[PDB]
Amino acid sequence: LVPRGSHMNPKRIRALKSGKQGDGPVVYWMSRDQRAEDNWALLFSRAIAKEANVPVVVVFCLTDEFLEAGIRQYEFMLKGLQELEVSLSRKKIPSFFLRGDPGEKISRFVKDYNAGTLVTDFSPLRIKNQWIEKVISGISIPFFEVDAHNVVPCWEASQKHEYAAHTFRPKLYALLPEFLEEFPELEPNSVTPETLSDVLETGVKALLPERALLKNKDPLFEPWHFEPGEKAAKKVMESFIADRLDSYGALRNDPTKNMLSNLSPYLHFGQISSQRVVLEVEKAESNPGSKKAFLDEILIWKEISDNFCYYNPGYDGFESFPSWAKESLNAHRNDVRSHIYTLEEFEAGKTHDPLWNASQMELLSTGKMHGYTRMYWAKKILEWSESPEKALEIAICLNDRYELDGRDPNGYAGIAWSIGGVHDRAWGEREVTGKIRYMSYEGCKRKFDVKLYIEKYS
Ligand SMILES: Cc1cc2nc3c(=O)[nH]c(=O)nc-3n(C[C@H](O)[C@H](O)[C@H](O)COP(=O)(O)OP(=O)(O)OC[C@H]3O[C@@H](n4cnc5c(N)ncnc54)[C@H](O)[C@@H]3O)c2cc1C
Numbered sequence: 001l002v003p004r005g006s007h008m009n010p011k012r013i014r015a016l017k018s019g020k021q022g023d024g025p026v027v028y029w030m031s032r033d034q035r036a037e038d039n040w041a042l043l044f045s046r047a048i049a050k051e052a053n054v055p056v057v058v059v060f061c062l063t064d065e066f067l068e069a070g071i072r073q074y075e076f077m078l079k080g081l082q083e084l085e086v087s088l089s090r091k092k093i094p095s096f097f098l099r100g101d102p103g104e105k106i107s108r109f110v111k112d113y114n115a116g117t118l119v120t121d122f123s124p125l126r127i128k129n130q131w132i133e134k135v136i137s138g139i140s141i142p143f144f145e146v147d148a149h150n151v152v153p154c155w156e157a158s159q160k161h162e163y164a165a166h167t168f169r170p171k172l173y174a175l176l177p178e179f180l181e182e183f184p185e186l187e188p189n190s191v192t193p194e195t196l197s198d199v200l201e202t203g204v205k206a207l208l209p210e211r212a213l214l215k216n217k218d219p220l221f222e223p224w225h226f227e228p229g230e231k232a233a234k235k236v237m238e239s240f241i242a243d244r245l246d247s248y249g250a251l252r253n254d255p256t257k258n259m260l261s262n263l264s265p266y267l268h269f270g271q272i273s274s275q276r277v278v279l280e281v282e283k284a285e286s287n288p289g290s291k292k293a294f295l296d297e298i299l300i301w302k303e304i305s306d307n308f309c310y311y312n313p314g315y316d317g318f319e320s321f322p323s324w325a326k327e328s329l330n331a332h333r334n335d336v337r338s339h340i341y342t343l344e345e346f347e348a349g350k351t352h353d354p355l356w357n358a359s360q361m362e363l364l365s366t367g368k369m370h371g372y373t374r375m376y377w378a379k380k381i382l383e384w385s386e387s388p389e390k391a392l393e394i395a396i397c398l399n400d401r402y403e404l405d406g407r408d409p410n411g412y413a414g415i416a417w418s419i420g421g422v423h424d425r426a427w428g429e430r431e432v433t434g435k436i437r438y439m440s441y442e443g444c445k446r447k448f449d450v451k452l453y454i455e456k457y458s
Pocket residue numbers: 252260261262263264265267268297298299301302303305369370371372374375378399403405406407408410411412414415418
């Protein structure tokens with residue numbers, strides 16, 4: 001229960017576990033949505049706290065899986081969290097950063113701090129479901145989840161996997177009048193109920209030996225492309241609206257032009273609300289076509305990615321591909337590939353294709369490959385791998401290791417679109433790739449200045 005007129009639509013919250021309510025603070029276990037503003041999970045947690053006459057507190061687990069990615073993501077996330085600490089402190093909301101995996105750490109915290117209710121944000125990924133299962137086994141209090149990432153809650157937008165954007169789109173757009181709304185301000189707590197710097201230091205030291213380096217032993221990553229945190233995210237949104245949105249419709253598929261929003265790293269960590277971005281873009285007057293194209297990406301393609309992962313347990317495997325694509329890829333399994341590269345050769349941009357290599361270098365150096373070349377990149381991994389299963393493994397590995405926005409439903413769904421035709425149709429049949437949409441080098445040369453892209457990233 002929340003207080004009458006709290007402005008919380010109950011369709012945004014799902015019970016994970018019934019239990020017996022305790023009398024202490026409401027705990028928001030923050031995971032996907034690393035921000036204080038425009039956060040329905042935090043807002044719901046505050047509202048339940050107010051109804052129960054207790055404070056809200058935030059807990060975040062610094063998990064054991066950080067070593068599976070790089071310094072680039074760890075520093076981006078933790079610097080955001082340092083700013084978040086302050087934001088939450090200004091609302092008199094304490095934040096606790098627990099070192100370890102959620103099952104042990106969240107269970108113990110709930111007991112030690114006498115928590116009344118536990119609330120988390122929503123992610124459809126396997127690792128969050130693993131964590132939920134272990135937490136559920138370790139607690140006796142009620143446990144809810146709130147979809148703070150999507151404009152329309154994932155379980156409301158559709159009751160099933162949607163095979164195409166054109167089947168999901170009408171369902172989603174029909175629910176915007178209900179779910180696309182302004183956020184209430186977060187009410188502070190009535191009274192105030194190892195530092196992150198130390199953790200960051202220790203974590204970086206553990207990651208240092210696996211840092212991406214050029215032949216010179218100088219690091220590849222350039223950390224000045226995306227300043228982390230809530231405040232920076234808002235400035236990137238504003239600069240997008242002011243300077244890039246007008247040309248987005250025309251230039252979104254030109255990797256030589258900096259005309260995308262550049263919001264993905266911030267959206268991935270939830271340092272900015274996609275609902276906020278949509279409210280601001282909807283209000284803007286910009287060139288015809290650009291708003292339509294942008295909203296299709298941040299509403300339809302982003303939210304269909306959650307739909308995909310939520311409703312397909314095997315979202316990172318061949319089995320989740322559509323029947324037509326599985327049958328087609330199987331028919332061409334024994335076709336001889338034109339090249340076969342090792343993971344190391346792919347990783348280091350050592351293929352015979354200079355466009356592919358440049359795309360990989362953009363990823364290595366900036367942590368954000370242009371959206372258009374991501375499609376090209378993943379499709380060539382299918383073409384130059386022993387099997388579609390190996391291609392998935394390779395693409396996922398590199399995406400997750402090097403993209404700031406990686407380890408994300410958008411990645412799994414984008415890779416599945418690219419390699420497996422998920423959310424696509426059948427195209428002309430070719431050897432090796434069957435009926436999976438093909439993106440040729442020469443097609444790219446016709447579409448944009450390939451030589452310039454290659455010069456930029458070599
Ligand atoms: C092989 C492959 C891998 C990808 N890996 C990821 C990933 O790991 N993480 C990730 O966030 N996106 C991924 N994408 C989707 C997309 O390429 C990025 O979201 C986009 O390039 C991010 O840049 P931007 O924010 O400047 O994009 P903009 O064009 O400004 O779009 C704004 C936002 O809309 C959403 N969006 C845009 N395009 C897509 C799309 N095709 N699918 C789903 N959502 C979209 C994203 O949240 C993005 O931040 C992948 C796509 C492919 C083809």
